Structures are given as structure tokens and as C-alpha cells.
């Protein structure tokens, strides 16, 4: 890698495939239309023509090679043969079923029989796509197969007696859909946890590369599964992608990732970057043979609070007034003729985001290069077309472009080097405590790319609603204010940059979300709010959803919380923005979520709010059967 | 050498025994329930007992002993003449209207003789060059006149006032209740500002005198128009120990120093740290100790505290936190021989009464200047016994019926004019970096504040007719909020709200003591100052476990004075608040404000509907406006 003189793209010799042109993008685009309006008895067939176009495994082959290329991991030749057999089997049985139900006349009893052939084919074959020791590659294949099965079950339930389903048989399908949509999520996160955890210990750069793959090929579909029981929601992905430059880092635990590092990468989650600072040192010897540059710290400053950001690493000058803040010190030293430094430079470098209608960095050219045997080693730092640092190493350091089409640079951070990440987890919060981590150095820079769909919030700090939108998603991290003793929780299966964990035991727990109405908004249209939250223990006073507008506060819903280990979707009663007194000129309007103080066992999570029009939204698959009193067992009959 | 009491050889008079104490006690009674046509006469018996200036003489000598200031012999004789004139004319009036039968027209003329006597003699107590002593005497003569005016208004035709004459007295009351406040603050500001430039310890000693002899009565003026409120003083007393500080400006006091003294204004002290240095030369003749920093840590947020001064070790791993370092150095006879740098910690005991009561803190410079050291002791726990060979005398810091709420210092060697905009109640670290302090400041809060600072909650008793919530005794507060020194409110200060975008709010936690009658009708008095108009006004709410009620929407048209807003009646049943409620709040919120709209919150007063009345209105009854001149 050090002998090769190639322009590089995120540490690779070739530019990566744009996120919008990946093999699974047409499947995600179809699911977005299906989740907004489900085509009854056609939903599964149209999904099948995207997963298995022309009754071929061609798309699942294109997914495998794209993923193998990105991970630089490969399945065994014989395992590929096996998966070909399993695809052929699923295609054979599913073509028979869809050929039958697309005749103008068919027998409902036969359609019922061929449906279950397809369903039990997927139940028995699925474990072939949970491939032990190759979870990184197989998680993207397993994702699509679970998606295929869940789309089949949904279409069968809405089909009813048209495909020979009696009321009691329609109830048995609802019982399986509700069971599988949780079990598949569990079995998905089993694969992700193993591989992410294994790579956190091996190489942080490789771990971020795997999480980036899952952000595009996996987590958009787990979110689609959680929305599949509905019609008239919006499929949205706000996961960020992370690129790593610098010396290797390893031996990170998942607890290290969740407790510290991920909070350190996210900085102020509800704000765009303002400027990032680098603690730079340069060193040259008397003989002009040694030229070494080091980055000892990164200090990202975001557009506002309530999060407080400090040094990751340190901002100290070593090797040289404490109450004075030194930004730069040069030193030239001459010695008696008969490794000692001749020139040293210590500087705080600043990269400032431009103030314009588009206050974001798009691309970056950051690289670190070690020239054997170790005399030269230096850094280039460049955002967009602005050079922050050109290496004072005499030889030229190759370009290392960081970019993703339809993404922009939201965060710049680093991983502390030379210290354990197991400390201060309880005091790395969204407010009050300084989000920092002291280390002797970093010798790495991490860049966070957020998708262009988030540009409107991070530019304005408000959620602008258009009357032409059937649905809008408010991710929990895009808040205006949040209560103390609140944490950022990594919940990637939600296809967001995370959830808010509330832990305050005394005063109470609340997050506010600024909303605006775009001009021409119809304040008479009836809306609903979906609140997704996990609360594993009973709250006596439950969780309150409110609108606040310039002293006019409405209670939109009191959520009864009896305690559940899973994610819950509370749907409010219908309302209009006329009910709330909000207009296209309101400027202090918020949605708010609040609970009382919570003990250790009562600490709960807020994922997102979904605003839907009443006229287009329906629960198509219920949490409980209609007729039968209990779901059957998976036990003996 | 001799033991000292707050830097003096003789102990100071206990706060409960000062000459104005009986006057304050009567005003507390009369503010709960006014005696119609007797209020002025009973107040006269407290200010001029037995028709003598004996109490006003006692006040003068007490305050003179406290400030080490004295009126000239000639000015003393003049005041005796003034007191005689006021007493004689006040006694004639009170004797005549206490007869079985009197003529209303004659009572009317004797009233104006008394009222116009005070108006023409009052400026004799705004003594130029002696405002320090004269402020306490001016305070009582203003109290005397406002008492007479209120009784004139309630007597009406009984003392010969036609409805139009009654309105003119209401016009005079409303003018003078503000004008006397302004003329008081002019005296206070001149003397406080003069002493800040001279000597900070001497300046805090003046504010302490005003917190007992002056500011309780300015608060009493603001409650005199009502009946059924509570008169309360929550001002802290401040004691200074260390090297002299001078050339402080009043702007530095409000903008920085006072905020540093108050620390977390809604919390009790948990621990305080001291940055200590000890130096001893080769000859064992020089022993010097210095205090370079004070770091007070309070019970909780939302305030974040930092070093006042610094926590650095001078004269010696920037990643590791060193708490102590000793050095013994031997040179070649042919400079330091022993040095100690240490972070000392005084920790408040964790008990049913988690407060220091007293302190013994002293700094002594032994001329020629070889010895100089510190003693630091809270209660019976010694934090530092000076390593100077000679014993440093005792310096007892205590106030009967007060306890230690805050420990802080004044930054030495730096200008106090910086970062005023970023010294906030929240978000920003409440610190001020300086090379040293060489002083320690102790804040004593009165025992009436113990309940709140112990529990972080306002417990309400069913047997009490009124309860005062000082603004600084909050649970949570919005960002871009400031502590505002407002000693005329008889509290340790107000909240200033300056957030431009998100909003300004403050919550106060309330609990109900067992046996609380939840069916009793109550009202809330909200004292605020909003100089400019607010389109969405100021909202007052109750919050309880999700149940949130609006208690009042205040219209803010804009006014430069302190405005009291009185909410509509309500029961705790209406709010769903019980004796088992633990999440009950009173809340005050407004929208974002620009620079002109920035407003202040002084206090909330909870009053029973049955015993509360506005006896003196803010506008006349019959005449449309207060009389113009030309």
C-alpha cells in the first residue's frame, strides 16, 4: 500500500459506488411507494420483481459482489453454489404462486395451498442466509430474504378470502407477521452485533466501513419492517456515514462504542458544524533528514447548544504562561558543531465552515502518510477547496478524497489514542457535562457524512412542514431542547443517527422539536402523530405529547406506559394546526414529549415522531387478532 | 493577640436584637391584617415610642458603631429638632382622632399639618456626604409617612376626605411609594459605590447593614397597598477575610463579582476547595502561606462552578491531576528550602442538617513581613492550621439565626470587567481566572431559607396565610438567564431573562405538608419588571405529573417599574395536587425577547383568597386621572 502512488478515495484505489446507485436502491424506492399506498394482492408480486427480476438471482448476485467489494470479504466458492440452489428454490415456488393468482379465474383453495408452499419454503430456507463466520457479507442477503417473506405475509392478510383465507386463517397470518417482524429484527441485530463488535476489536476503520455498508444495504429495510403494518407513513434514512484517516486503532468494545466513542463522533447531534480545530505539531532535526507531523487533538465546535464540546485528545503544546492561550509557537535551534530538534512548530489549525445559503462542507481531502523507514511522516488537511494544512514533509502526500454523492459533511471528530474508552460513560450526556475525552494524542481524523434530506433541519434548526407531504419524520436527535441526564443511544435499526435515553430521577424528562409551516399550508387538514418509544417498565403518570405555541399549550396525548421490552408506536387522536393555533407565521411553535422522573429500571428511549395526514393513514395489520382469543403456539398440535 | 469577631475586637449586636427589629415585627403584623385608622398610630408607637426619639437615637448609634461613621454634633442637634417637630404634630393629630367625638373638618386640617411636615422635613435625612448613616433614618421617616397616607385613604370621610380628596391621597401614595424607593436607592448606590472603590470588606459591611436596617422596609413599602401578604427578608450577609481589595466599580459588582459570590443560587454548599501554597526559606526565618483559588461545589445544577482564581501549582504531567506536592531542598552554603502546594477540601457533613453554622478563618501579616499565613476552620473541623510558627488569632464568623450557604472569593490581580455576558445561571462555567485571590468570602443565609436549601422544594403549610417564593430558589431555568442583584426586594436577587429565540422560563418545586386543605382558595402574586411590550405576554402555569393548568396570561404593555400581577382564585384540587404529589411545579414562561424586551422576575407570593385584599388601588376611583399642575 505504501509503494503504490495512486490518488485514493477513502483509502481505496477506486472511487466507491454512489449510495443512490447501489443494487438495493430500487427495492428501497419501491418499499417507499408501497408503505405510502399498498397495492392489495399486488404488493408481494411487485416486491418479487425487484428482489428477483425476471425470475433470476441477478439482483442478489449484484448485491453480493457490491458488498464483498466494499467489505473486502468473500464467501467461499461452495457457499455461493449453495445460495444459488436456495434462490432457485424460492424463485421456483414463488413464480408458481404468483402465476396462479394472476389468472382472471382461479380456485381460492389452490391459491391458499400455493401461498403456504411459498411461506414455509422461506421459513425453512432463511437459516442458509445466517452464515456463521461470514456475517458481514450474509447480513445484506438475509435482509432481502426476510423482506421477501414479510411482504408475502402482508399481501396474504389483506387478500383474505380472495386467496382462500377464512377469518381464523387470516388471524393465524397476523400472529406470524407480528412474531416474525420482531424475530427477524432480533436475528438481523445478532449478525450486525457479532461483525461490528469483531471489527471494533480488529480495526476501527474496518468497523466504520461495515457500519456504513449496513446503513445503505440493511438498516433502511429494518425500518421498512417496523412501518410495514401501516399505510401512509414515510420510509426515511438519516444514518450518517463515517470515514477514518490516520494510524490504526483497535481493541474497542461495543460498550466503548456506545458509552463514549459514538457520542464523541456525533458531537452536538441537533446542530451543524461551525468550525473544527486541530492540535498540530511539526518536528525537524539538525541534519534535515527527519520531518514528522502529528495531530494530538480535534475540537469540533457546532452551531449551537445545548451540547458542550471539548478536546478529543488534547490542545496542549508538549516539548516546550498557562493563563495565556497560545495558538502558535515556532522554534529554530542551532547547536554546537561538536535526535535533537532544529525546527519545531506547534499550532492550533482551524477549518471554518463558510457562511452562505449552504453552510456545509461537501468533500474533504485528508491523508496521513508514513514513508519507510520512518524519517518522513505527515498530514494533508483540506475541506472542499480550502487548504487547512499542506504537509511540511518534503515528498508529496497523495490525495485521499472523502465524498458521498447526495451527502454533506455534518461532523468532524476523532478517536482518543493511548487511553481506555471505558471511563465517564455516565457523564457523557447531551447537556450540562462537557463532551470531551482527554488523551495524549489521536493521530486520526474522523469525518461524518449526513444525507442531503437532513440539510433543511441543520440549516434552519426547524422542521419545515409542506402541505403537499402525506408524511414527515422527526428523528429524536433533531431536537431544540432536551432535559438534563439524557444520553445519545445508538439505535441503527431505526435508520437514524440514534435515540434519546431519559434517566433524570427527580425533575422530569422532556424533548422539544421546533416546527414551522411553509407558506400556503392547509391548517384545516386533519393530522396524527406517531410516537415511537421503548419503555421497559411501568410509568405511573405515563408519557405526555404536547403542542406549545407562544403560550398556547395543548395536550395531544397521554400515553399509558405499562412496560414492554420492544419499540411501541402510540398514535394520537386526529387534530388540525387550527386546533393548535399554529399558522404560517408562528415562530415559537414546538412539539414536546415529557415524562416524570424515572428510576434505573424506568429509563426509556425516544426514537422518532411521524406526522401523518388522517385521510391517508391506516393500521392494516393489528397487534392482536380480530376473531380468535389467542394466537396459536409454535408447539405441538 | 486578641480573638476577633468578623475582623473586630468587639462582637457585633445579634441581628434579632437591632433597634429596628420591633418596627419590622409590627409591619409584618400590619401587612397580614391592617388596623383601620389605627395602623399609623401603632406604627408611631414603634418609631417614636412614648413620643420620644429614643428608638431613632438607638438606630443612629448602632449604625454608627457598625459603619465606623459619625454624624457631626451640629447635624445631630438638627435631627433632634426635626424629630421633635414630627412627634409634636403627629401626637396632636393622633390624640384628636382617638377622641369619642371629633369634628371631621379639624381632623382633616391636622392630617395635612402632619403629612406636609414630613414632606418638607424628609430631605433633612438625605444628608449629603453622610448617606451611610442617614439611609437608616430616612428609611423610617418614609415608612412613617406611607403609614399615615394609607390610614388617610381608608378613613375617607371619617377624617374629612371627600371622594376627590381621597383620590389625591391615592395619587400621592402611588407617587411616593416609588419616589421613596428611588431616593432610597440613590443613598444606597452612592455609599455602596463609594466603598467598593475604597475597600470591598468595608463595602460588604455597608450592604450587610442595609440588609437588616433598610431593605426589609423597602419591601414593606411594596406590600403596604395590600392586606394578607407576608413580609420576609432572604438577603444573605457576606464576610470577607484576606488582603484588601479596592477600585471595584458598581458595574463589576453586578456584572461579575456578585454572581461569583452567589455560586449556584438554588443549591446548598456540598464542599469547597482551596488552592494552598506554603514557602519556607533556607534560614527558617520566612514562612508564607497564600490562597490562590476557591472552588465551591454545590449540591446540584443547573449552575456549573469553577475556580475563582486558579487551581494551578506555580514554582514547580499536565494529563494527571496533582492534589499535593512537598519539596525539601538543600543547597551549598557557600531561595526556597521547603515548599508545599496542596488542594485543601472542606466537606459539609451529610446529616439531617447539612450546613456549616460558623467559621474561623483568618489571615495575619506579621511585620516586618517574614510570617504571613491562614487558618481555615468550619464548625469544629480544622481544614488548615497555619504552618507559621506563631499562633494566628481566632476570627469567628457567625450570625445568630443564620447559616453558611456559600463560600467564594474575589479574583485578585485581574480586571473584573470581562465576560459579564457569559457569566450566566446555566450553560457557561461560573468561574473567573486570576493569578490569586488571597481572600475568602462567606455568605450567611437566614435560617428561614434552610427548609428550601435542605429539600430543593417549597413545602406549603395549611396554617400559613401567605408564602413567598424568592425567584432564585428555582428548580430549573432557561439558558441566557442572569442573576440580577435587587436588594430592595429583600431577596438575594432576581432572574433576568435574555433568550432571543427558544424562550424564557423558570420552574419552582412545591410540596404540600400532610393535613393540607386542598379545597382552600388561593391566589398567586407575580412580581416582575418588563420594560418593553411582549406580544405573547407572560404565562403562569401549574404542572403536576402531566396535568398542566394555565393560572394566568399576563398582558405586558411595558412599564419601567416593578409590577405585581394577581391571578384568579384557584384550589389545589383544581390543579390535581395532593400531599403525595412529588412532581408539582409553578412555572413562568415567555417567548424569545430582544435587548429592549429583557425582563426580570423578583418573586411569587402565594396568598389565601379569604385574607387577601388590594386596599390601595393603582388608579383613582372618581377622578379620571391624577391631578396635573398647569
Numbering used by the authors:
A (entry chain A): 12 to 331, 336 to 353, 360 to 658
B (entry chain B): 16 to 331, 336 to 353, 361 to 656
Paper passage:
Cry11Aa and Cry11Ba are the two most potent toxins produced by mosquitocidal Bacillus thuringiensis subsp. israelensis and jegathesan, respectively. Cyt1Aa, Cry11Aa, and co-crystallized Cry4Aa and Cry4Ba. These are produced during sporulation and are remarkably stable in a variety of conditions, but dissolve after ingestion under the high alkaline pH levels characteristic of the larval mosquito midgut. Solubilized protoxins are activated by insect gut proteases enabling binding to gut cell membranes, subsequent oligomerization, and ultimately gut cell lysis leading to larval death. Cry11Aa and Cry11Ba structures maintain the three-domain organization characteristic of Cry δ-endotoxins.
Our MR-phase 2.4 Å resolution map reveals two Cry11Ba molecules in the asymmetric unit. All residues are visible except for the N-terminus (residues M1-I11), two loops (residues S332-C335, and G354-S359) and the C-terminal extension (residues S659-K724). The lack of order in this extension is not surprising given the low complexity of its sequence. We note that the buried surface area (BSA) at the tetramerization interface is 33% lower in Cry11Ba, pointing to higher flexibility; this hypothesis is supported by the absence of interpretable electron density for residues at the N-terminus (332–335) and C-terminus (354–359) of the βpin in the Cry11Ba structure. Cry11Ba crystals assemble from tetrameric building blocks analogous to those in Cry11Aa crystals, as judged by the similarity of their crystal packing patterns. We assign crystal packing forces to two types: those that associate monomers into dimers and tetramers and those that assemble tetramers into a crystal. The BSA which associates monomers into a dimer (interface #1) is 38% lower than the homologous interface in Cry11Aa (1009 Å2 Fig. 2e; vs. 1631 Å2), explaining PISA’s failure to identify the tetramer. Moreover, the emphasis on lattice-forming associations (rather than associations within a tetramer unit) could explain the larger crystal size achieved by Cry11Ba.
